[PDB]
Ligand binder design. Structure first.
Ligand SMILES: C[C@@]1(C(=O)Nc2cncc3ccccc23)C(=O)Nc2ccc(Cl)cc21
Ligand SMILES: [Cl-]
Lengths: 297, 302
């Protein structure tokens, strides 16, 4: 029993974190093979700023050992520093771009030194509600699938509302954001409906059935209610994805949708679901199956 | 900005997790130097669980009965001793990935990260607090025994918990790494219940200071309270008595925000009386009690 916001073990990623210094700016780098990936704003027209830099201007540090930079290129908003030493601790990895609603683990780092690990979700507005201070830039988001680390996020900036914006590891931002000091705002956020439903199934699995009802709804009627409560549209793909949880608990997806419709119109009424007074939307249907079945890495 | 339930990076601990098999029972072990620490109930046969005599069960076991596995490599057990409710298996190989470590016993209200493992393989990491009733509200399935709780302050890993059992309410009970249980619990299948839980008042106040630091002041008020009057109200909501030690511990947060501890205590009393009124504090509709005053300073400043 128990349901917790659980991150993937960060060990495979810790072995990659390095400190990248360029002039006054100090942030984190991801050292994979002989390349160190970091936000391109470490140099701060990035093509013009980078052409003025030499390899010895980038001081890379892995523990107490300094890596010597032998090349530098830019791929969208990420700087790829070619180094002389290939990281022996480089895990099996892939660079994946995640979709909003998908969750990942963030290894927050300051001065190439991992300080904490937390779970979060790519919000529908392409921001993440992270926990970052100055020096956290270059901190990465990842998932582990068997023995392979899928890098999906690299932290770049904090928006004025306290939410965070970053890129995939190919330097492509999530959202309509740019990497410079300018007026940028996080768009109106929405709740990840498929994730709330997954968390309601986890609650059922954990012996919390008060919110269940004899009712079931149509996908059209659920989406009409969901749009009114700033909830993401639930697709037939989402219903199919919730299939295993629906099978395991005995509550059809549209039965749990009638439960969510009642929770949205009526509220929790002094009650909690999995120790929460709010509808949690940062557990995907896969996170619920992984935690309520015990998959290992 | 941002406030998250943040666990310590688990890497230093992952390198220690091993699978301990003794007969039918398979659980996790913590391999530090040439010793593998695991719950002593690994020697029990379920029908030797209501009233196990571990000294009698262990005297019957030999070193080759304990199959220890670190990855695909099998460790050879060369000795075995028992220290309270933990089994210490002396192995022939010292773990090269052994970090700088200490065994620390924690007090209720203290938090720690848990690296949940199954078959000596880490599956997840989460942040926990030792509840005032000495249980933890973990996320554990069968086969998670031996999973450890830790804090990684500086470069040293302080091991504070080893998972042993799940109580009938779904909460978990375990020991420090010296095998001493937290709480009035025993490693027996006998009827054991978690005592009435309470809210860690010092941690709620710390989380309210984190909220002030993050620009959330809606809950603040023009009132102060005596410490006695705060506890009289707090006790009625099942909140732990706030001691002068707790007030002293909150001193730095009070200094940083400019809100005296007893004024933050008046805000808390008001939140207990009124609730949130559709509002949230740091994305929560409930008063969070699993962030110590130290966790708040670490996450908000360094
Ligand atoms: C092995 C066991 C235990 O609580 N294990 C578990 C530990 N943690 C989580 C579990 C979730 C589901 C099932 C079993 C879980 C048990 O089933 N009875 C019993 C009695 C005494 C002790 Cl010290 C240990 C146990
Ligand atoms: Cl303590």
């Amino acid at each position: 029993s128990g349901f917790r916001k659980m991150a993937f073990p960060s060990g495979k990623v810790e072995g990659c974190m390095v400190q990248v210094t360029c002039g006054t700016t100090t942030l984190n780098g991801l050292w994979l093979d002989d390349v160190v990936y970091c936000p391109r704003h470490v140099i701060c027209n990035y093509e013009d700023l980078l052409i003025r830099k030499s390899n010895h201007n980038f001081l890379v540090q892995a523990g107490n050992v300094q890596l010597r930079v032998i090349g530098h290129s830019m791929q969208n908003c990420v700087l790829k520093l070619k180094v002389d030493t290939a990281n022996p601790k480089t895990p099996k990895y892939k660079f994946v771009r995640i979709q909003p609603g998908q969750t990942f683990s963030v290894l927050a780092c300051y001065n190439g030194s991992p300080s904490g690990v937390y779970q979060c979700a790519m919000r529908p507005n392409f921001t993440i509600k992270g926990s970052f201070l100055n020096g956290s830039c270059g901190s990465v988001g990842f998932n582990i699938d068997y023995d392979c680390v899928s890098f999906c996020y690299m932290h770049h900036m904090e928006l004025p509302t306290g939410v965070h914006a970053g890129t995939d590891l190919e330097g492509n931002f999530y959202g309509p954001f740019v990497d410079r000091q300018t007026a940028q705002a996080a768009g109106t956020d929405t709740t990840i409906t498929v994730n709330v439903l997954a968390w309601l199934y986890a609650a059922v699995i954990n012996g919390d059935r008060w919110f269940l009802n004899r009712f079931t709804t149509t996908l059209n009627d659920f989406n009409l209610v969901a749009m009114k409560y700033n909830y993401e549209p639930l697709t037939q793909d989402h219903v199919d994805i919730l299939g295993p949880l629906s099978a395991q608990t005995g509550i059809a997806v549209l039965d749990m949708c009638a439960s969510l419709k009642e929770l949205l119109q009526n509220g929790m009424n002094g009650r909690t679901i999995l120790g929460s007074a709010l509808l949690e939307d940062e557990f995907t249907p896969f996170d619920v199956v992984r935690q309520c079945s015990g998959v290992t890495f």
